[PDB]
Design a protein around this ligand. Structure first.
Ligand SMILES: *[C@H]1O[C@H](CO)[C@@H](O[C@@H]2O[C@H](CO)[C@@H](O[C@H]3O[C@H](CO)[C@@H](O)[C@H](O)[C@@H]3O)[C@H](O)[C@H]2NC(C)=O)[C@H](O)[C@H]1NC(C)=O
Ligand SMILES: *[C@@H]1O[C@H](CO)[C@@H](O[C@@H]2O[C@H](CO)[C@@H](O)[C@H](O)[C@H]2NC(C)=O)[C@H](O)[C@H]1NC(C)=O
Length: 537
């Protein structure tokens, strides 16, 4: 009997209890700070939520500290909900977050460290005039929250967006300020969308064109595009566009308003929510954090004593084509790599399963690249309006095609009674144009009852004719993060196989299609544990 088989070895999570939204991520004086919605009293959401706090020098190894922000004033007496960090000139980190006041309404509060001499910024002081911002005229008391990191315009005026909705229409309410204390709502929202519901944890930032670097939030210009991100209808959506400080205008590149449909982009197509990014000027990259909810039952959570994980932090940038974002785990993760097992020029015949020996199958970093033959044999299927997730749930690893399913079997039992299959399928429309589907088939990830085993999928924007299909998987016990085509398509999965309680996991490569596929190259590394030190009480 293995203890806590579902706890991860290198993903961030508190010692125990419930954790959701990542809060105020930032880099300050050489230290990476991470905060998060935390329930000090249970492994479920609760009436009292506070900001947990941890610090790190590399985003991999962490030191758990005492919570940083917890109810101490009327403006946040019932709870301290999500917010973001902005480092103001003069080198002072300012935290804006949504507090639940004594009247149970959502208001925006300000706090900043009380002891800048402390490398870990443990103590925080709250502004005497909180709340700084209260719900606009026609907005309900519980539909106004999650202030973003602020950006300073060329006119010396600060901007921030706060999420909410006006009559069920998602809103990114824009506020302005020069002293960061007195804020005035701009006449029009920065962006919005009809019937989406409250926009949660909005994020607004620039990305450099033709570059894999990150930018400080306040950069603007012609060689820069902006990303408007918001969570609603259960997922995190984003759209790339152009921002004009002058008129506070955000113009979507594709001219669409978010609808939460297969028409819009997401950072990740699996369990991924309340994502928040920050600029890291030490490495000149933008890092993205995201809450990964549990998919087991609440009773299971209370039983194991904890709930919620954070995705492994990923660098973020805009693709060469400028039509979507690219994500990739921060390079620091590579330091966890131990022994390596590699394969090259290996054919995977139809219906075959190849086991990868010598790897810690429950805690690994696996990359594989497939070279295809006989593309003309791809099943004919126009995918213009097809819902990729629906398609993966309809056709799992057991549904045999021509090109596909071929990919990986992770967190699998020796007898394959339980397995999580991450794979691809290749289709072509009537005109001979190819499309690529990436799937995380979780239908057989566990034999346990009361586990949400819904599968996830998304189309990958690559040309199978000229580029091999690559896949990287971060396997860490109850979480699997899959990156297709170098980060073009990401899918995070939560799995709870029963076998992990008594036996070891296995890793396989497979091809259940009728066409042959070749592994041009595969690299697998056992990953050692990240260190988590407690410096509390
Ligand atoms: C992909 O290749 C096979 C394509 O179907 C798939 O076969 C599995 O095993 C048999 C077919 O050989 C079938 O199992 C059926 O019978 C069992 C009896 O216990 C039922 O429980 C199943 O639901 C099903 O009716 C299925 O076709 C399939 N079984 C399943 C779903 O596990 C292979 O499993 C596939 N290979 C991989 C690596 O996924
Ligand atoms: C402000 O932060 C500094 C830096 O952490 C604190 O100073 C340290 O305090 C501990 C405990 O008293 C000592 O063991 C260290 O030697 C101190 N180091 C430094 C840099 O002086 C300081 O105590 C904090 N101030 C307050 C009000 O708590």
């Amino acid at each position: 009997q293995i203890e806590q088989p579902y706890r991860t070895g290198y993903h961030f999570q508190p010692p125990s209890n419930w954790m959701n939204d990542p809060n105020g991520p930032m880099l300050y004086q050489g230290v990476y700070h991470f905060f998060y919605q935390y329930n000090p009293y249970a492994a479920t959401f609760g009436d009292v939520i506070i900001w947990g706090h941890a610090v790190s020098y590399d985003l991999v190894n962490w030191i758990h500290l005492d919570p940083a922000i917890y109810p101490t004033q009327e403006a946040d007496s019932k709870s301290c909900w999500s917010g973001s960090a902005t480092i103001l000139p003069g080198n002072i980190p300012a935290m804006l977050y949504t507090g639940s006041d004594s009247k149970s309404r959502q208001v925006q509060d300000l706090a900043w460290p009380k002891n800048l001499s402390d490398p870990f910024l443990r103590e925080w002081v709250k502004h005497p005039k909180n709340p700084l911002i209260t719900p606009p005229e026609g907005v309900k008391d519980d539909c106004f929250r999650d202030p973003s990191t602020a950006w300073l315009g060329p006119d010396g005026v600060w901007r921030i967006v706060v999420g909410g909705d006006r009559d069920n229409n998602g809103m990114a309410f824009l506020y302005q300020s020069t002293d960061f204390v007195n804020w005035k709502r701009y006449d029009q929202p920065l962006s919005s969308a009809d019937a989406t519901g409250t926009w949660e944890c909005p994020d607004f930032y620039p990305v450099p064109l033709n570059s894999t670097n990150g930018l400080d939030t306040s950069v603007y210009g012609g060689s820069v595009r902006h990303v408007m991100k918001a969570g609603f209808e259960g997922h995190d959506w984003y759209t790339i566009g152009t921002y004009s400080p002058d008129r506070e205008n955000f113009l979507p590149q594709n001219g669409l308003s978010l609808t939460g449909s297969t028409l819009d982009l997401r950072y990740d197509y699996g369990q991924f929510y309340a994502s928040k990014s920050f600029f890291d000027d030490a490495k000149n990259r933008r890092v993205l954090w995201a809450w990964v909810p549990e998919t087991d039952s609440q009773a299971d959570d209370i039983e194991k004593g904890w709930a919620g994980l954070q995705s492994f932090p990923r660098a973020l940038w805009i693709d060469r084509n400028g039509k979507q974002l690219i994500q990739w785990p921060v390079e620091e993760i590579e330091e966890l790599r131990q022994n390596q097992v590699n394969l090259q020029n290996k054919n995977l015949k139809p219906g075959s399963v190849l086991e990868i020996h010598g790897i810690a199958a429950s805690q690994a970093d696996v990359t594989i690249s497939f070279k295809l033959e006989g593309l003309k044999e791809a099943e004919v299927l126009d995918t213009t309006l097809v819902d990729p997730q629906a398609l993966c749930n309809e056709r799992g690893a057991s549904s045999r095609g021509a090109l596909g399913p071929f990919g990986l079997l992770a967190m699998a039992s020796k007898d394959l009674k339980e397995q999580s299959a991450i794979f691809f399928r290749v289709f072509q429309n009537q005109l001979g144009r190819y499309s690529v589907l990436m799937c995380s088939d979780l239908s057989r990830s566990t034999v346990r009852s009361n586990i949400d085993t819904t599968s996830y999928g998304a189309f990958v924007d690559i040309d199978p004719r000229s580029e091999e299909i690559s896949l990287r998987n971060l396997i860490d016990h109850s979480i699997i993060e899959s990156f297709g085509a170098g980060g073009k398509t990401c899918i995070t999965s939560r799995i709870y196989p029963k076998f992990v309680n008594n036996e070891e996991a296995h890793l396989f490569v497979f091809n259940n299609g009728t066409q042959n596929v070749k592994i041009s190259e595969m690299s697998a590394w056992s990953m050692k544990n990240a260190k988590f030190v407690v410096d509390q009480s």
